[PDB]
């Protein structure tokens, strides 16, 4: 309400368009020894310190979850995107590409991302179950599908009568306080009777659900060709912030789409299984945009997502991919995204192979 000037918080200011290329002037270059963060190349220890795990569900206490179309991710220093070699005779040959950052994820495996949960959403990493207290809420996994066919599961550990979880997929723009299907960008199942919920509309084109159901979830979206028919460029936003005691990265998320025309992604579908037994097709009409597996809680619902290598009734398809596979695929993809952005800003020129892949 003042002017096109300094950011809304004096805690950290990013370089405005008039202060272009202003890197986040957060912590000073003068660091303390510390000792705990003095890991070297000879030691074998994961620098991403996961919090203490507790059998009772807990809350991430100092994480400002996504809002206003503003995505929030973990940050690590990464003082140099590694390009160190011998001192070449030409002192103007190589570029260090000092991004001084990375999207390192606080996860041993592809799990339910804590960055995209509601403040009323509790997790227990003993089974990575998710639970709530009042009404409905939504959580999502770490990964997100953009093409191909894949598959995961949800295991339900507690379903009292006043406890009805919902399980399915949701694109970004999905308000994580809504019950996973209240908008047109989410398609789920209600875990009282198998009922497909989308646009808050319930449809009985489905089988029946059981209290101890280990439910399999198969979903096939077309390649990014039929998804976009154009450039699927991924120019990323990256902003450095130093929240109360830790460094984090902000990126710009998508905006609420007013899409009211139906253009289904070609040959995309969703299939639901009960313990591998085909519960049937859920949604053939699938809108564009990346999707991610999501779970909605009612009052005190206990469910958990699960990947493929520890499966119970897996499909024997050679094309579908477990949660972990697409997870590390997207992780490596965002690594290359950081690489390319630091290249763009740091070294003149860019170049990519024969487009098709």
């Amino acid at each position: 309400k003042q002017s096109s000037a300094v950011s809304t918080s004096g805690n950290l200011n990013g370089g405005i368009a008039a202060g272009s290329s202003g890197k986040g002037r957060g912590a000073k270059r003068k660091q303390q020894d510390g000792g705990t963060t003095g890991t070297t190349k000879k030691a074998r220890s994961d620098p991403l310190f996961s919090a203490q795990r507790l059998p009772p569900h807990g809350y991430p206490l100092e994480h400002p979850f996504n809002k206003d179309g503003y995505r929030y991710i973990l940050a690590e220093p990464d003082p140099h995107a590694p390009d160190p070699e011998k001192l070449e005779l030409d002192c103007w040959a190589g570029k260090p590409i000092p991004g001084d950052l990375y999207r390192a994820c606080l996860y041993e495996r592809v799990l339910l991302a804590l960055h995209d949960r509601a403040p009323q959403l509790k997790i227990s990493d003993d089974r990575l179950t998710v639970v709530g207290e009042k009404g409905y809420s939504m959580v999502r996994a770490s990964h997100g599908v953009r093409k191909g066919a894949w598959y995961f599961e949800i295991t339900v550990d507690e379903m009292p009568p006043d406890t009805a979880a919902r399980l399915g997929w949701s694109q970004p723009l999905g308000n994580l306080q809504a019950p996973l299907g209240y908008d047109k960008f989410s398609y789920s199942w209600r875990s009282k009777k198998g009922t497909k919920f989308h646009q808050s509309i319930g449809k009985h084109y489905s089988s029946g659900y059981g209290q101890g159901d280990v439910l399999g979830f198969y979903i096939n979206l077309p390649e990014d060709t039929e998804t976009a028919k154009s450039l699927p460029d991924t120019y990323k936003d990256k902003a450095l912030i130093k929240f109360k005691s830790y460094l984090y990265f902000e990126e710009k998320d998508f905006v609420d789409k007013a899409e009211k025309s139906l253009k289904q992604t070609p040959h995309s579908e969703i299939i639901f299984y009960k313990n591998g037994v085909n519960q049937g097709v859920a949604y053939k009409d699938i809108f564009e945009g990346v999707y991610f597996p999501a779970i909605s809680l009612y009052k005190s619902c206990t469910v958990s997502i699960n990947f493929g290598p520890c499966f119970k009734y897996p499909p024997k398809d050679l094309t579908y991919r477990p949660m972990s596979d697409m997870g590390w695929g997207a992780v490596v993809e965002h690594t290359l995204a950081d690489v390319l952005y630091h290249v763009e800003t740091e070294v003149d020129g860019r170049r990519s192979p024969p487009w098709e892949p």
Partner: protein, 153 residues
């Protein structure tokens, strides 16, 4: 004093501290019945604590029933809707010069919107605070203050 103890004291004394009478501001409004000191708890805007996403569905509902919306934003996530269920705080007029001010407190995990006194309020005074209503395109104000914005918005 502890916010819980102060809140218990406020909920004990609220029924006999304030009243509602015919108001020269507009219609009926909240008047002071016993001299209220500055910063002390005047009144809770008690009502139905709801989440924000359910506001519109309620509002349109009232819009379908012709019943006025009595909602105050607790925060970006919660709202006290007093349209159907509330207390006397639904009769606090506004003044550009308020002797009161709204603040959100946390008691045992639940948030309460309490109007406290900006100054030492004396008996008979009509209670008014800053609604801080965003600028629309216009509600004339008759608070009587010399600094009156002529409009809440």
């Amino acid at each position: 004093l502890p916010m819980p103890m102060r809140f218990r004291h406020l909920k004990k004394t609220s029924k006999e501290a304030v009243g509602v009478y015919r108001s020269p501001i507009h219609g009926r409004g909240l008047f002071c019945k016993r001299n209220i000191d500055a910063g002390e708890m005047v009144i809770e805007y008690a009502g139905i604590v709801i989440r924000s996403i359910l506001t519109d569905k309620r509002e349109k509902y009232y819009d379908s029933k012709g019943i006025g919306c009595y909602m105050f934003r607790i925060d970006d996530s919660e709202v006290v809707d007093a349209t159907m269920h509330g207390n006397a705080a639904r009769f606090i007029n506004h003044s550009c010069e308020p002797n009161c001010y709204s603040r959100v407190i946390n008691i045992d995990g639940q948030k309460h919107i309490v109007i406290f006194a900006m100054r030492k309020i004396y008996r008979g005074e009509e209670l008014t605070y800053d609604y801080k209503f965003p600028i629309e395109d216009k509600l004339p104000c008759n608070c009587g203050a010399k600094k009156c914005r002529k409009f809440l918005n």
